[PDB]
Amino acid sequence: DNIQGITKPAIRRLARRGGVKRISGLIYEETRGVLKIFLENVIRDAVTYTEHARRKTVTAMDVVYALKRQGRTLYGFGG
Amino acid sequence: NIQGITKPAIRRLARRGGVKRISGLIYEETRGVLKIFLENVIRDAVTYTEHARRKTVTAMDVVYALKRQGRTLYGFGG
Amino acid sequence: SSKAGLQFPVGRIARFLKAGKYAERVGAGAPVYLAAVLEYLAAEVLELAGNAARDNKKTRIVPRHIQLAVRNDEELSRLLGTVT
Amino acid sequence: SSKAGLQFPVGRIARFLKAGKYAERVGAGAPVYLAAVLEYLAAEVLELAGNAARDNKKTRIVPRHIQLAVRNDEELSRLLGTVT
Amino acid sequence: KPHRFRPGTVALREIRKYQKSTELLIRKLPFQRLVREIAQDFKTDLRFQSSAVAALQEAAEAYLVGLFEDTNLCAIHAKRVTIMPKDIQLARRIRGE
Amino acid sequence: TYKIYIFKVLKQVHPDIGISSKAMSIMNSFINDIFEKLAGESAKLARYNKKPTITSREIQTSVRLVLPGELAKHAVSEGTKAVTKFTS
Amino acid sequence: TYKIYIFKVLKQVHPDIGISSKAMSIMNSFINDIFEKLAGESAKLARYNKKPTITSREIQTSVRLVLPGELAKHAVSEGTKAVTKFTS
Amino acid sequence: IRKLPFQRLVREIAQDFKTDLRFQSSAVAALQEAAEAYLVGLFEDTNLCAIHAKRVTIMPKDIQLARRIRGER
DNA sequence: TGGAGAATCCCGGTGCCGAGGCCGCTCAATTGGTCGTAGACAGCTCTAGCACCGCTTAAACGCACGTACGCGCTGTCCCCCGCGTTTTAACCGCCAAGGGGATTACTCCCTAGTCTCCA
DNA sequence: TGGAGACTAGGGAGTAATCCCCTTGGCGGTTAAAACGCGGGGGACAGCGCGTACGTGCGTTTAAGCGGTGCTAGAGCTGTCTACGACCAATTGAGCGGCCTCGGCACCGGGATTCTCCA
């Protein structure tokens, strides 16, 4: 599966960036689940914005608007 | 008058919140948090009132101040 | 509203859209769709509140019943996460 | 713009206000006030970003410097709490 | 032989009674005096409608109830039962306040 | 003030169950907030696409964005049904 | 885009400090977001009292509402100074 | 996060909502940046939760709490 | 394994005032023309997204093993809960003052609409 | 080609006054909670130990990365042009406040039933 592509080293690097020092072995499955939930919640809005404009190409602006709508505004990718 | 929020009031609020047991230092922190929240809402409410050139704060001003903070409130007009 | 088979005021909602300055022009389809969506949401919330009231053996909806209906359902709770 | 000493385009700001249908009518003072507020905020943010960059011994501004400036100041932090 | 409840049972009874009820849990007159004292700083000689004060009281009570729910969750997370200042501060810190 | 229409809807779903003044005000505030949310999102979508006319498509996209999951599905179905019945 | 004006402001505050393409885009996005916030809040303020005109007072109220604390106060001072200079 | 596996994950997730979708590289990059920022913030909050509980090893019952407090699930 | 004090609920008796229906009537919802134009549609350009496929190699993966530490156990004591007493001010009803919300009217001044020009 | 400038008229704004509604400020008085103090027990916690699992280094895949190769789907835009929506106006009826009634509910008394400790 592609979700398994987010392996242990990636989650460990993210945790080390977030301040965590020692990570339990069961964190990784929860981290993948949370990442999938977040990606679903952003992609639904992005795809809805894309379908509204009758386009088949998801662009940067759709993703930026989807993020800004979730109260997670992002800068540097247009708009 | 912040001391007017007596200990039994905070006890009742905590019991409603589902807290089984309360330390003795919660009360000062709860008063501080209540003051912070009231200041945050009242600043916006008074700003909305002062915009309309009035000296009477209305219910709509408070409701809009709550709605701008992410604490939308129903059943008081709008 | 009669032609659309709705209990909501399509004309009043159209007037609100036009006077609200949301957009320069409002197509005829928009007020009917918005009235239908509002009617469906109101019907759902009122149905949940009434079913909650029938459990509490009270025949009059009150804020407690509305709060119970909002918090017992997951979708509405997600919609009304920050609503008192 | 140059008449009031402000670098921001008062004319462009007025056009943006009118085009976006924010109001039916726009006063002659509102674009000047908005230009002043935007210019002050931009100047403050750029100054903080440059000051943060100087500690890094770099002669150019990068998104890392802007992120540091945003996360350092408390007021900008509250204004930009959820900005990446 | 006076019948005395063991420590804790009456707290749970109060929890059940209060969660079963809906009325406000803050004295109205001290809350109104507090609101006037706080609003004195932002604008001098203001006047509050009764409904505005009631709305402020309802909002404050709802906010405190939510904060105490999150504080109780934080306390249970640390295997304690007694909520403490380190539990309210964490619940505020996570929310971003 | 959507009080009369909310009352009619409640009678449609519950013929015998009434509603209090506070509950009626809560329902009215909820309807007003939902309507303002949908209208604001439709205005944002129209401005982003530069189309000055709010059509059924903008309202449909706004409903898909605001209402989650089953609520979104049923609301979109109801709106499409109402628009189809109105046009015909 | 506000790239020219942001570039000039940055050169004014820091002549010896330059800016890259990504940093300029981030600053432009921040300026656009602030402008959208202030304009939307002024529109909401106008809609609340049903006054169809946006003046310096509406912008000042929106600045007080959106910007917090000392930023709001300094922005109010800057706007008042600029409006007074312009109208004179 | 690795670029290509995350791109495949994004495409797989988008497959369900609407089949036959084509992504600009900019949109994928923005989604990856947002995912990284959200995960970093969540892990910081989880670290706070685990420090509060007299521990240094974060656990799934800490991420769950840090998301329950925010109100994400 | 039952007994005892505290606490809550069932049946029935009161009152109450707010929900529920009536009804002017007035202002807004429509329907019929009329006109200006944005959006539907067709068609053309080509930008950029998708798929193959080989060569590199850093990164993920599996194993071994030691040590930090997470969790169960235990006893000290301290400080919060339950409680009886007192004291204090929230709170209910009266009562007026009047200060400011609320139009109503009128003038007058400021901004949108139109035409011309240039950085 | 959008920003600047000048001319023109038409409607929102500021102001005055008045009307009266709601808020502020007292005052008397019954009384329901705050304040306070006194056990005591129970949970906070500080130390202890032991077994579990996580970090690190090492050897070995393996899929990411790049680059180079190709195509071609649809973004992007322009040109017609027609069905749509704004505007206006006579019409009329639906919702607004203000009148009423009455019945479902609030709350208590007497008594019955159930709950937390305890011998």
Numbering used by the authors:
A (entry chain G): 25 to 103
B (entry chain H): 26 to 103
C (entry chain B), D (entry chain A): 20 to 103
E (entry chain F): 38 to 134
F (entry chain D), G (entry chain C): 65 to 152
H (entry chain E): 63 to 135
Please quote the paper that reports this structure.
Excluding archaea and few instances of eubacteria 2–4, roughly 147 bp DNA is wrapped around an octamer of two units of histones H2A, H2B, H3 and H4, forming nucleosomes in eukaryotes 5. One exception is the gene locus LOC_Os05g38760 (MSU gene model). This gene locus encoded a previously uncharacterized histone H4-like protein that we named as H4.V. Sequence alignment indicated that H4.V resembled H4 in length (103 amino acids) with similar histone fold domains albeit with minor modifications. The histone octamers were insoluble when folded in vitro with H4.V but were soluble when the N-terminal end (53 amino acids, accounting for most of the variation) of H4.V was fused with C-terminal 50 residues of H4 (named H4.VS throughout). In order to investigate the differences brought about by the residue variations to the nucleosomes, we performed single particle cryo-EM analysis of nucleosomes reconstituted using recombinant histones with either canonical H4 or H4.VS.
With recombinant H4.VS or H4 and H2A, H2B and H3 from rice and Widom 601 nucleosome positioning DNA sequence (NPS) 47, we successfully reconstituted nucleosome core particles (NCPs). Processing of the datasets using the standard CryoSPARC workflow yielded three-dimensional maps for H4 and H4.VS containing nucleosomes at 3.6 Å resolution. About 20 bp of DNA in NCP entry/exit positions in H4 nucleosome was not resolved (from about Super Helical Loop +5) suggesting the presence of an asymmetrically flexible DNA entry/exit regions. This observation was consistent with the recently published 47 Arabidopsis NCP structure. Interestingly, when the structures of rice H4.VS NCP and rice canonical NCP were compared, unlike H4 NCP, both entry/exit DNA regions of H4.VS NCP were well resolved. A closer look at the amino acid compositions of human and rice histones showed amino acid variations in C-terminal region of rice H2A, which likely contributes to its weakened interactions with H3 αN helix as observed in human NCP 5.
